[PDB]
Amino acid sequence: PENQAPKAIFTFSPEDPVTDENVVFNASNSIDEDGTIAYYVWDFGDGYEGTSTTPTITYKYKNPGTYKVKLIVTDNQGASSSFTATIKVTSATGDNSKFNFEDGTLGGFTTSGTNATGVVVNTTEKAFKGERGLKWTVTSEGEGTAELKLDGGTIVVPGTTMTFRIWIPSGAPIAAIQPYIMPHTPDWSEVLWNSTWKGYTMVKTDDWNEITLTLPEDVDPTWPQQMGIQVQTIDEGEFTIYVDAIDWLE
């Protein structure tokens, strides 16, 4: 009459915790079909482990990151099963992004445009993470283009996915917006255009938009790079875009 191993499963809340916030892990749908569960053993993925004879446990992560949480459930006869899930923890305060703007600086960012003029300041009015970000005000005179840009030595290695956060307002005279990275030879004889084109109708207005962009792997790693955000304007008008927490790995 061979013993069946118990079934191990858990969920957690909140789905998106911050550092030092309580997460409740709930293994209550775990079950032994032919006996009872004796205990629940948890590995929180950060160096700490814990056990309970009951299916819930609460836990706090001190540092941001992505943790693998492994649950082992053991029945009254010593048979066990495991279930592993991932939890992402973000910083409760501050902003550790590659471009976080928390030092009050422009981070080397400048503006340019044609049939449009941009100004950029470091602001506390809106931020995606931390207390600060960029506030980019564009005055367009009609059909044109405006850039918020960083020149442009070697910003990222080829293959890198960048994440931009952009607060886009409603009722703006814009057709499209696009984060871009533009590698070029030092003398501009060869230029590569990489961008994530978003139409103005395909955008969350009066809200933060998370847009990713990959620099392709086959780009020459020695080429200087311009990274930025480009807006296409379609009519006269003044509008303000917020930019913060531009981030990538390595």
3-state secondary structure 156-196: CCCCCEEEEEEEECCCCCEEEEEEEEEEECCCCCCECCEEC
- Closest CB to Ca ion among 132 and 184? 132
- 244 contributes a contact to Ca ion by CB under 5 A: yes
Q: Which stretch binds Ca ion (CB under 5 A): 21-29, 45-53, 167-175, 241-249?
A: 241-249
For residues 178 and 220, what is the distance between their CA atoms, to the nearest angstrom? 22
- Are residues 244 and 134 in contact, defined by beta-carbon separation less than 8 angstroms? yes
- Residue given tokens 């008008």 in the structure block: 237
Residue 34 touches Ca ion, criterion: CB under 5 A = yes
Name the residue nearer to Ca ion (CB basis): 17 or 133. 133
Q: Nearest distance from residue 148's CB to Ca ion, in Å?
A: 15
Query: Considering the rule CB under 5 A, would residue 107 count as an interface residue with Ca ion?
Result: no
Q: Which stretch binds Ca ion (CB under 5 A): 92-100, 104-112, 146-154, 181-189?
A: 92-100
Judged by beta carbon, residue 87 or residue 241, the one nearer Ca ion is 241
Q: What is the DSSP string of 83-103?
A: EEEEEEEB-SSS--SSB--TT
Choosing from 130, 144, 179, 228, the residue that interacts with Ca ion (CB under 5 A) is 130
The C-alpha atoms of residue 58 and residue 170 are separated, in whole angstroms, by: 42
Is position 147 an interface residue for Ca ion (rule: CB under 5 A)? no
Nearer to Ca ion, 100 or 178 (CB): 100
247 sits near Ca ion (criterion: CB under 5 A): no
CA torsion sign for 143, 148, 153, 156 is negative
Check the annotation: does 95 bind a ligand.
Answer: yes
Q: Is 250 annotated as a binding residue?
A: no
Of 128 and 239, the one with the shorter C-beta distance to Ca ion is 128
Interaction between residue 75 and Ca ion (CB under 5 A) = yes
Query: Residues 6 or more apart from 105 whose CB is under 8 A from it?
Result: 122
Identify any residues that bridge with 235 across adjacent strands, giving them in sequence order: 142
CA distance 9 to 31: 9
Stretch that binds Ca ion, among 7-15, 53-61, 133-141, 153-161 (CB under 5 A): 133-141
Is 218 annotated to bind ligand? no
- List residues near Ca ion by CB under 5 A: 3-4, 32, 34-35, 75, 95, 100-101, 127, 129-130, 132-133, 244
- Binding site for Ca(2+), residues? 3-4, 32, 34, 75, 95, 100, 102, 129, 132, 244
